[PDB]
Every structure is written in structure tokens, then in C-alpha cells.
A paper describes a structure:
Although many of the biological effects of the human cytokine interleukin 6 (IL‐6) have been studied in detail, little is known about the influence of the glycans present on this glycoprotein. A library of glycoforms of human interleukin 6 (IL‐6) comprising complex and mannosidic N‐glycans was generated by semisynthesis.
We also attempted to crystallize a synthetic IL‐6 glycoform and started with IL‐61. The crystallization of an IL‐6 glycoform with a full‐length N‐glycan (data not shown) was not successful. Notably, in both structures the unstructured loop region ends at Asn 60. The three segments were connected by sequential native chemical ligation followed by two‐step refolding. The glycoforms were characterized by LC‐MS, HR‐MS, SDS‐PAGE and CD‐spectroscopy indicating that the correct fold was attained and the formation of the disulfides was complete. The native helical fold of the set of IL‐6 glycoforms was independent of the glycan and only the overall intensity of the spectra varied to a small extent. The resulting hIL‐6 glycoproteins were of high‐purity and were properly folded according to CD‐spectroscopy, LC‐MS, HR‐MS and X‐ray crystallography (one structure).
Numbering used by the authors: 16 to 50, 60 to 183
The structure:
Amino acid sequence: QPLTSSERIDKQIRYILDGISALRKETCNKSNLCENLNLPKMAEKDGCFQSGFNEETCLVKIITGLLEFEVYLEYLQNRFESSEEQARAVQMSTKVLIQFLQKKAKNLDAITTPDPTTNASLLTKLQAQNQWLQDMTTHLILRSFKEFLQSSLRALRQM
């Protein structure tokens, strides 16, 4: 029995969570404090929770949110000299996931693309913080991205 489109998405999310787990271990090892910021987050109106569950509004939110996360994953790869390959694997893994999800939504279309030139300003603002605030930013991106993916996986199984 070959993987269905749903099973492939489900596996790809668990695969990226295993990667975030591995990239957290390298960025925490490297941090000298380990071992404002508006990151995508599910709310009840997005239709991804059991209360107010709405399959179509939910799938649009998952895709919109992953697209909004890409500049943060570029921030991680641009920073992690040592964890270079691992951070790039997470970016490219997230790109394949977005492609699987866009095939599922091919019936819906539209979707809010983030503005490129706002994302290039965000990037510069993030890279000009002192090392403390950049280590905090890294932690908050990895935590928030993990929580988005777990919420996405729960919603996708309820479809």
C-alpha cells in the first residue's frame, strides 16, 4: 500500500520535528547560556482547534504560517556556522512540506504570501541584536516553530 498524500504530509511533519529536536541540541550546545518578536501562532479563529474546527480555514492558516516562518528559518541558517547543514536541512524540509500542503489546497488557491522587502528588513533587525538577544531569538523561533508543527499535525489528523 503506497503512502497517500495525507500520510506523506504526516511523515514530513514528524521528520521536521526530529530535525528541530536535532538542531536545538546543536544551537544549545553552542550557546553560552544553554545546556517585540511576532512568530506565527494558531488561535481559535484559525479553525485548527477542536473548538471551532474548520478544515478549509485551518489548511489556509497552516500554509500561511509556514510561509511566514521561512524568514526565521533563514535567520537560523545564516547564524549557525557550525550547525550550517542542519539549519539548511530544516529550511528545505519546510519547503517540501509547503509544496505537499499547496497540492492539498490546490482546490482553494489564494493564500497570503509574506512581503519579501518586509522580510529583508526583519532579517537585518534580527542580525543587529546583541548576542544575548540573538540566542533568545533562536530559542523562541525553535520553540514556536515546534508548537506550530505539533498543532498543524493534530489538525491535519482531524481532517
